[PDB]
């Protein structure tokens, strides 16, 4: 790895600088290097890893959607293979980023994560990046990719419900994304709606236990659940 010669602490420091400069590809490479040092990640370091790759894959997903739309229109004047070729190029890049993240989780973040907050975080991430693979998958391994996302989300859910209070932001963000998995990927809008509503209601009833700062963290994610329920119902 090109980051093998840099100190772990220097990689984390530069990841934070890259975030300030909105250089997310750099940020991701720095955090990949930090992960490959082999030590577990702190809470803040996990969120640096997540922010970096979410922004990288977010740009790829947005570009893929633009190109896929153009391609679908083209298939309703013939302009040659270029639209498909370039959509395939972006798609392959996107799949490579997803494979990279999943590789870091499998070697060896998840197996060393024993605390609920780390294990749920990583399993949610595993579900997320299989979901992004599912967004562009067509047919053959599409079913297996979808089941891999489902399995990761489900293990994360089981742990979060046993070990975390209903207002825990990690638990809430997991439920949010799993509900979108149901709605957008698994063709299960009723499951999506039920999960979002139950998650929201159980969090509501637990808010009274929280400090002002924790209340703000939890209600921010609860608003995203409500925003989806407004779109879906």
């Amino acid at each position: 790895g090109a980051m093998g010669s840099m100190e772990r602490a220097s990689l984390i420091q530069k990841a934070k600088l890259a975030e300030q400069a909105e250089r997310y590809e750099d940020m991701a490479a720095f955090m990949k290097g930090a992960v490959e040092k082999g030590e577990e990640l702190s809470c803040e370091e996990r969120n640096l890893l997540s922010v970096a790759y979410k922004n990288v894959v977010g740009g790829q997903r947005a570009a893929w959607r633009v190109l896929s739309s153009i391609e679908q229109k083209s298939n309703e004047e013939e302009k040659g293979p270029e639209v498909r070729e370039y959509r395939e190029k972006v798609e392959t890049e996107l799949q490579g980023v997803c494979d990279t993240v999943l590789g870091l989780l499998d070697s060896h973040l998840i197996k060393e994560a024993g605390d609920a907050e780390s294990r749920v975080f990583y399993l949610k991430m595993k579900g997320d990046y299989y979901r992004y693979l599912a967004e562009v998958a067509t047919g053959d391994d599409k079913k297996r990719i979808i089941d891999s996302a489902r399995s990761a989300y489900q293990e994360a859910m089981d742990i979060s419900k046993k070990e975390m209070p209903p207002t825990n932001p990690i638990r809430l963000g997991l439920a949010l994304n799993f509900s979108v998995f149901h709605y957008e990927i698994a063709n299960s809008p009723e499951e999506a709606i039920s999960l979002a509503k139950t998650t929201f209601d159980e969090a509501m009833a637990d808010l009274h236990t929280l400090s002002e700062d924790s209340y703000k963290d939890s209600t921010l994610i609860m608003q995203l659940l409500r925003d989806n329920l407004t779109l879906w119902t």
Binding site: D128, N228, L231
Partner: peptide
Amino acid sequence: SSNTLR
């Protein structure tokens, strides 16, 4: 477009 964690 559904909202996921940002």
